[PDB]
Structure formats: structure tokens, C-alpha cells
Amino acid sequence: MKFIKYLSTAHLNYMNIAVYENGSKIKARVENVVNGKSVGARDFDSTEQLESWFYGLPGSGLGRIENAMNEISRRENP
Numbered sequence: 661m662k663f664i665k666y667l668s669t670a671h672l673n674y675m676n677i678a679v680y681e682n683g684s685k686i687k688a689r690v691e692n693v694v695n696g697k698s699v700g701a702r703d704f705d706s707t708e709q710l711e712s713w714f715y716g717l718p719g720s721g722l723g724r725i726e727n728a729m730n731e732i733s734r735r736e737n738p
Contacts, residue, residue, distance in 0.1 A: 662687070667714050667728065669721025677725055686710050690732040692725070700732035 664679035667690075677700070678691040686707050690700020704710050719727035 668725060672722055675722040675725050677729065681707075681710075688713065688732060690729045692729060699737065700729050701735060701737055702732045 661683040662680035664681055667677035667679060668675050674693050676693050678689075678693070678698075680689045680691075681687050686704035686709075688700075688702045688704050688710055689698065690702070691698035692700070704713075714724065714728055717724050717727050719725070
């Protein structure tokens with residue numbers, strides 16, 4: 661169920677964001693690899709907004725990792 665591609669462009673210092681979706685509803689969990697500790701948790705509803713989120717940010721590729729993660733990580737973690 662929880663199987664999504666990474667959210668990055670280039671490759672520098674192992675920059676990538678692993679996402680995960682639920683079979684029931686849409687889920688967006690920004691998991692980093694650089695630090696080795698997933699720092700992202702969010703709850704979505706429609707897949708449309710899911711992509712739109714990572715598509716439009718002021719960041720670019722690897723740069724979107726510091727912006728997106730910083731956003732999805734806004735809320736506390738489990």
C-alpha cells in the first residue's frame with residue numbers, strides 16, 4: 661500500500677524524499693535519507709493536491725527538499 665517514488669531531481673549528498681500513501685486515503689510522509697531520520701508527516705485527501713504540493717514550491721529539485729520537508733515537518737512527529 662505505502663509505496664511512492666522519491667521527490668528529488670539531482671543527486672547530492674544523498675538527497676531524496678520517500679513518500680507513502682494509504683490504501684484508504686491519501687498520505688504524504690516526507691522521509692529524508694541524508695540525516696537518516698524521517699522528518700515529515702502530513703495527512704492529505706486527494707492525490708491531485710498531493711502532487712501539486714511538491715509541484716510549485718519556490719525550490720528546485722534538491723532545493724525542494726529543504727522547503728517541502730521543512731513544511732511537511734511543521735507538525736510534530738510520532
